[PDB]
Amino acid sequence: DDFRDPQRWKECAKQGKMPCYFDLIEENVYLTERKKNKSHRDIKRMQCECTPLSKDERAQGEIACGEDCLNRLLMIECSSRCPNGDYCSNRRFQRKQHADVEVILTEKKGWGLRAAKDLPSNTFVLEYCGEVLDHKEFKARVKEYARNKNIHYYFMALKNDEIIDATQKGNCSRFMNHSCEPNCETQKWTVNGQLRVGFFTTKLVPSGSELTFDYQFQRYGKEAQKCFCGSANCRGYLGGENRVSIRAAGGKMKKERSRKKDSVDGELEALMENGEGLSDKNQVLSLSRLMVRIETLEQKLTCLELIQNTHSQSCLKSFLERHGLSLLWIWMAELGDGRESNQKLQEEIIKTLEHLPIPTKNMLEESKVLPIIQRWISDLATKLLDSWKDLKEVYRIPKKSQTEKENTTTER
Amino acid sequence: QGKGIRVLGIAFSSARDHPVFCALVNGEGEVTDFLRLPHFTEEREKKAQDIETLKKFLLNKKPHVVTVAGENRDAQMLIEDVKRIVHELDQGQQLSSIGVELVDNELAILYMNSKKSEAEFRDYPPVLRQAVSLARRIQDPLIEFAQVCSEDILCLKFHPLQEHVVKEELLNALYCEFINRVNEVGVDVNRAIAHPYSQALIQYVCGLGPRKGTHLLKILKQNNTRLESRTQLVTMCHMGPKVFMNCAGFLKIDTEVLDGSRVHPETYEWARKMAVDALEYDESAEDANPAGALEEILENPERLKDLDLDAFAEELERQGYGDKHITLYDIRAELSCRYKDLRTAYRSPNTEEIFNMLTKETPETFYIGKLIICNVTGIAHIGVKTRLDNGVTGFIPTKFLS
Amino acid sequence: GGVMKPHRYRPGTVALREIRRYQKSTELLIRKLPFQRLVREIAQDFKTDLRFQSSAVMALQEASEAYLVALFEDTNLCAIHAKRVTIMPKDIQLARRIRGE
Structure with a gap:
């Protein structure tokens, strides 16, 4: 049913009977690995304290480095300098001692695994292997890949700044599903100084029974997903109900002590990811707080674009209620010092003021925007003043009604 | 890479061990180089000399396409063999296969022995002249038409019934059609400044007559004035106000922003305002400064709603003294795309069309019942397959002979 | 679709890992400049305007670290005798009382 063969075959995507559409993978690979680690300065060797015999096996023979070893209890595999040498049983990630697995279809929720034969507790099954990302690439590739309409995301956070992708290349551990009654689990073992993720069993799994592991629940966009197991209390949904951010999903980078700018950029981008402006008053509040901290022209322009793309009258009213006009006034006053590079920001500010549902001229007078705009691109400001006063104009090209846009689309 | 494509006009004379001209002219209304291929499949049994000659010719240069002519079955077979060799050996450009599109030997033959052909090449054979003509006809028909006397149009017969009727009406209709096509496609001001191939195209312009175009070309050549904008002939004192008004929608320049389009000076302000509104950009004497509404709109449709x-019509009526209900679409098109070409697309020769172009004898000429002489020269299996009077493969089946 | 994190270490596992890591090595555990400032401050109470030798401060640091390590080694036995995992100030005080301090 697995049938690993190197020739690519005629199975599109489901990988149930023909595993050679993507590529498989050995122990994982890195991209920006530098020699800044605890590898060979204090973890040079962590040798167990064992006084073995090793001359009596198969008769009055205890297996070497059992559950009384100092390293197995602390989740460390031994090195080649073990006193047992080539008879130690800790080195399970290096001798590739695996379990008998098979991939067939069980439920319409997706593909998975079922146990071939009996398997006891605290037994290793498979190693999670993939491609190691880094700080910058994650938050770009994820938004580059969310627009590709994929169901399965093979992302696993090793540390607060490392996320492993098991999409382009993956071993047999990529098919394992989620259930609220877990019988296998994941452990963080340390081999050769590097951290690796493994899969252990917890009970006596019968021959022909399911082998899944519990997800530490997480969601990443606006949508939700639900589980189809329903053992006895199943939480219904993968990722639960609660939403968390791009950084919280990946673990937010250990900030290089540069600048503040990167936090503002990351929050601005999390606001922009929805692509349709502000959707709730919490987003409005976050934008209001960000504007106070934004110093760069690009960030100001991005905020103005987000406000313009916000179609929600309630969100616009909340932005006004939260002193949005004063926050815009700050940037407009900063614009006053006459450097040419500010023309585009001036135009975008005028557009945002046009888009904002300002109810009364008194609001602009109180926010002190009106004198700056009167001083102010000049025709954009004149159109803004004409919109705020009444009648004549710097003639405007009226924009065809939505009805007529639709009709002129359908007549082709 | 580069403006246009390198058309290799291949006009073979006979393809029977005789030199057939094959000139690789550039896509800028000019011929880059040429060559001859005396070797042909001459030799009664020589299936390698022609292939070697074709490979050497292909390796000599890097053409962008092949335009092979045709006269009879032998010419068609030679063209097919050349195309097959080029495709097999990737001889189109030396690094990929280039498809030789067939070109009927109808316009290139005429253009090779014309005044333009003689001036461009005097000490060159008629094979080279015909190859240059075919390349020109497969690169820019408007240039070739505008660079001919119109006698030159009268050379091509429209139909037999035209001879009986007065030819003056046919000439006037041809001149009107040419003027309309020139106006629709526009005229490149810089194209007729230094490139002889694209020169003398100011004879079929709307309001710019032949005498006016000649005077303008002479003034340009003397003063060294280029197509600065749509107002070049109004600023340099070369064209009168009436002439400028009549030929504003036909004159095009390389570079103002709306100089190389249908937008006239009267409609320049309206077009600028319309682009500003569509792009939602700031309006501040938007003729050259504001580049958003101009460049972005030209690069793509920014905002049409x-x-x-x-x-626009109300604005034109209130200020402008004219309704723009019909001219609004034209102004928007000129703003979005400059120097739009009104010519058709490239027409690949068809089976009947190819037969007419090369053999020059379509089944329409031959009718049932009339006596047609069949030159029986050979038989494949039973019948007698020979050549006819008009170069048609006349195959007499077993029925014809019993 | 979201990014799922694998798991959380069971508490005490990394604690024991650190126990081995710091019992294997031989280095200074205390922040040197703060230690130096502390020694200077408490020495100002006996004679104004003193001066120190670097080795004279290094020896103090070595002795202090050894003393604290021994104190904790005894206190851990006290806590275990009390049938507790967590270590308490009453355990520290008992250790000092029995030791004779």
């Missing part, structure tokens, strides 16, 4: 037909 912004420009309303009713609003």
Whole structure:
């Protein structure tokens, strides 16, 4: 049913009977690995304290480095300098001692695994292997890949700044599903100084029974997903109900002590990811707080674009209620010092003021925007003043009604 | 890479061990180089000399396409063999296969022995002249038509019934059609400044007559004035106000922003306003400074719902003294794309069309019942397959002979 | 679709890992400049305007670290005798009382 063969075959995507559409993978690979680690300065060797015999096996023979070893209890595999040498049983990630697995279809929720034969507790099954990302690439590739309409995301956070992708290349551990009654689990073992993720069993799994592991629940966009197991209390949904951010999903980078700018950029981008402006008053509040901290022209322009793309009258009213006009006034006053590079920001500010549902001229007078705009691109400001006063104009090209846009689309 | 494509006009004379001209002219209304291929499949049994000659010719240069002519079955077979060799050996450009599109030997033959052909090449054979003509006809028909006397148009017969009727009406209709096509496609001001191939195209312009175009070309050549903008002939004192008004929609320049389009000086302000409204950009004497509404709109349609037909018409009526209900679409098109070409697309020769172009004898000429002489020269299996009077493969089946 | 994190270490596992890591090595555990400032401050109470030798401060640091390590080694036995995992100030005080301090 697995049938690993190197020739690519005629199975599109489901990988149930023909595993050679993507590529498989050995122990994982890195991209920006530098020699800044605890590898060979204090973890040079962590040798167990064992006084073995090793001359009596198969008769009055205890297996070497059992559950009384100092390293197995602390989740460390031994090195080649073990006193047992080539008879130690800790080195399970290096001798590739695996379990008998098979991939067939069980439920319409997706593909998975079922146990071939009996398997006891605290037994290793498979190693999670993939491609190691880094700080910058994650938050770009994820938004580059969310627009590709994929169901399965093979992302696993090793540390607060490392996320492993098991999409382009993956071993047999990529098919394992989620259930609220877990019988296998994941452990963080340390081999050769590097951290690796493994899969252990917890009970006596019968021959022909399911082998899944519990997800530490997480969601990443606006949508939700639900589980189809329903053992006895199943939480219904993968990722639960609660939403968390791009950084919280990946673990937010250990900030290089540069600048503040990167936090503002990351929050601005999390606001922009929805692509349709502000959707709730919490987003409005976050934008209001960000504007106070934004110093760069690009960030100001991005905020103005987000406000313009916000179609929600309630969100616009909340932005006004939260002193949005004063926050815009700050940037407009900063614009006053006459450097040419500010023309585009001036135009975008005028557009945002046009888009904002300002109810009364008194609001602009109180926010002190009106004198700056009167001083102010000049025709954009004149159109803004004409919109705020009444009648004549710097003639405007009226924009065809939505009805007529639709009709002129359908007549082709 | 580069402006246009390198057309290799291949006009073979006979393809029977005789030199057939094959000139690789550039896509800028000019011929880059040429060559001859005396070797042909001459030799009664020589299936390698022609292939070697074709490979050497292909390796000599890097053409962008092949335009092979045709006269009879032998010519068609030679063209097919050349195309097959080029495709097999990737001889189109030396690094990929280039498809030789067949070109009927109808316009190239005429153009090779014309005044333009003689001036461009005097000490060159008629094979080279015909190859240059075919390349020109497969690169820019408008240039070739505008660079001919119109006698030159009268050379091509429209139909037999035209001879009986007065030829003056046919000439006037041809001149009118040419003028309309020139106006629709526009005229490149810089194209007729230094490139002889694209020169003398100011004879079929709307309001710019032959005498006016000749005077303008002479003034340009003397003063060294280039196509600065749509107002070049109004600023340099070369064209009168009436002439400028009549030929504003036909004159095009390389570079103002709306100089190389249908937008006239009267409609320049309206077009600028419309682009500003569509792009939602700032309006500040938008002729050259504001580059958003100009460059972005030209690069792609930025906002079309912004420009309303009713609003534009009302603005034109109130200020301008004219309704723009019909001219609004034209102004928007000129703003979005400059120097739009009104010519058709490239027409690949068809089976009947190819037969007419090369053999020059379509089945329409031959009718049932009339006596047609069949030259029986050979038989494949039973019948007698020979050549006819008009170069048609006349195959007499077993029925014809019993 | 979201990014799922694998798991959380069971508490005490990394604690024991650190126990081995710091019992294997031989280095200074205390922040040197703060230690130096502390020694200077408490020495100002006996004679104004003193001066120190670097080795004279290094020896103090070595002795202090050894003393604290021994104190904790005894206190851990006290806590275990009390049938507790967590270590308490009453355990520290008992250790000092029995030791004779």
